[PDB]
Amino acid sequence: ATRILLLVLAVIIYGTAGFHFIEGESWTVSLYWTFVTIATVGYGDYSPSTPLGMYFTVTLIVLGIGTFAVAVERLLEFLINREQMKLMGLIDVAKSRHVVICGWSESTLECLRELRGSEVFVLAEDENVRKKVLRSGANFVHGDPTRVSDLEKANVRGARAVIVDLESDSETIHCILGIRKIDESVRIIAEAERYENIEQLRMAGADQVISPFVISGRLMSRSIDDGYEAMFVQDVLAEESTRRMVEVPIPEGSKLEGVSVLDADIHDVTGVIIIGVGRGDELIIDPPRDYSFRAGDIILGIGKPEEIERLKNYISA
């Protein structure tokens, strides 16, 4: 690593000393001649005439190819080893606004199609997950997501959000409890499996808990007869065939700060069913009549994509 820098400095001290005291040349000439000889440039303006001096140069040339054969084998030992550790995980994340995904399933593959590629780091331990992650454009970190020593290789202290979706609810609770020991302020989004563990995923410290098997178990048992609410959930939340659930923010200015929901009358102007308003980490589903809008709010509503355009200009100034 740095023994190469000494040996390169050794042959400049062997060579310069040899040239100056045999040819009688200057110190600035003896430095200049050694640097065009080790580098195999060789202008030939200051060649050595004496047969002792001709035997000196041969020694310097073999030490020229000598140190260019120790520096090459140290570079190629560095590059084959670094591209092997980088390939099979085994590397430390250095980024600072990335998204870490603990575990890998279909629900995390579906959230890679709405995120960037090089921003996402998948921390898993299986060997088949490594080839699925590299095909999808994310980066693979090899580690146990429940072990706190391996949650720091993924750099979850300087991350934008962490997404936990593991094989059990035992590992999901234990991965949330380990992230909250490192960084108490990072955003954790977690997937529950059983209905009994939605409360234990929140007490462990998840900010958003999503339970897909409990939603899908209710829609299965309520579609045996008619299935009208399963058509609503599938066309608005899953496929977005004709409707879409949007959240739009109210900016500064915004032409409506202060009026009630009755005087604003967003539905009959626009055509968007207003569900609720997002006043700062709470959700008021069906706000009452005398709710007055503020700045920085977020309006959640269902509407056609040609009606959201009629809304996003209605609230902008």
Partner that binds at residue 193, options K ion, Cd ion, ligand PGW, none, CB closer than 5 to 8 Å by kind: Cd ion
In the complex with Cd ion, the residue whose CB is nearer, 233 or 284, is: 233
83 binding partner (options Cd ion, K ion, a copy of itself, none; Cβ < 5 to 8 Å by kind): a copy of itself
Partner interacting with residue 74 (select from a copy of itself, ligand PGW, K ion, none; CB below 5-8 Å by kind): ligand PGW
- Residue 193, annotated ligand binder? yes
Closest to 111 measured CA to CA, from 240, 93, 119, 153: 119
d(C-alpha 177, C-alpha 61), whole Å: 63
> 191: annotated binding-site residue?
yes
# binding residues, K ion (CB under 5 A) = 3
Residue 44 interacts, among Cd ion, K ion, ligand PGW, none and using kind-specific CB cut-offs from 5 to 8 Å, with K ion
Which residue from 114, 113, 148 is spatially nearest to 123, judged by alpha carbons? 148
Which of 10, 13, 35, 73 is close enough to bind ligand PGW by CB under 6 A? Answer: 73
Give yes or no for residue 44 binding K ion (CB under 5 A): yes
Residues near a copy of itself (CB under 8 A), total: 133
CB distance 274 to 248 below 8 Å:
no
> Among residue numbers 214 through 243, which ones bind Cd ion (CB under 5 A)?
218
- Annotated binding residue 171: no
With CB under 5 to 8 Å by kind, the binding choice for 93 among Cd ion, ligand PGW, a copy of itself, none is: none
Give the ranges where the chain is alpha helix by DSSP (H).
Answer: 3-23, 27-38, 51-85, 106-109, 128-136, 148-151, 169-182, 198-203, 212-221, 229-233, 261-264, 266-270, 309-312
Q: Which residues contact 278 (CB under 8 A, 6 or more apart)?
A: 247, 297, 298, 299, 300
**Site residues for ligand PGW, window 44-63 (CB under 6 A)?**
62
Distance between CA atoms of residues 66 and 44, nearest Å: 22
DSSP at 226: T
Q: How far is the CB of 20 from a copy of itself (least distance, A)?
A: 14
Cα-flanking dihedrals φ and ψ of residue 73, to 5°?
-75, -20
What residue type is assigned to position 158 of the chain?
Answer: G
- Euclidean distance between CA atoms 138 and 282, whole angstroms: 33
Interface with ligand PGW includes 222 (CB under 6 A)?
Answer: no
The answer to whether the beta carbons of residues 201 and 175 sit under 8 Å apart is: no
The answer to the question of residue 75 lying near K ion (CB under 5 A) is no
Gap between the Cα atoms of 56 and 18, Å rounded: 7
35 binds ligand PGW (CB under 6 A): no
Q: Should residue 80 be labelled a site residue for K ion when binding is judged by CB under 5 A? A: no
Q: What are the CB-based long-range contacts (under 8 Å, 24+) for 126-131?
A: 129/104, 130/88, 130/89
84's contact among a copy of itself, K ion, Cd ion, none, with CB below 5 to 8 A by partner kind, is: a copy of itself
250 to 269: interface string for a copy of itself, x by CB under 8 A: --------------------
Q: Which residues are annotated as a binding site for Ca(2+)?
A: 165, 191, 193
Give the residues lining the site for ligand PGW (CB under 6 A). Answer: 1, 4, 62, 65-66, 68-75, 78
Give the residues lining the site for Cd ion (CB under 5 A). Answer: 105, 191, 193, 218
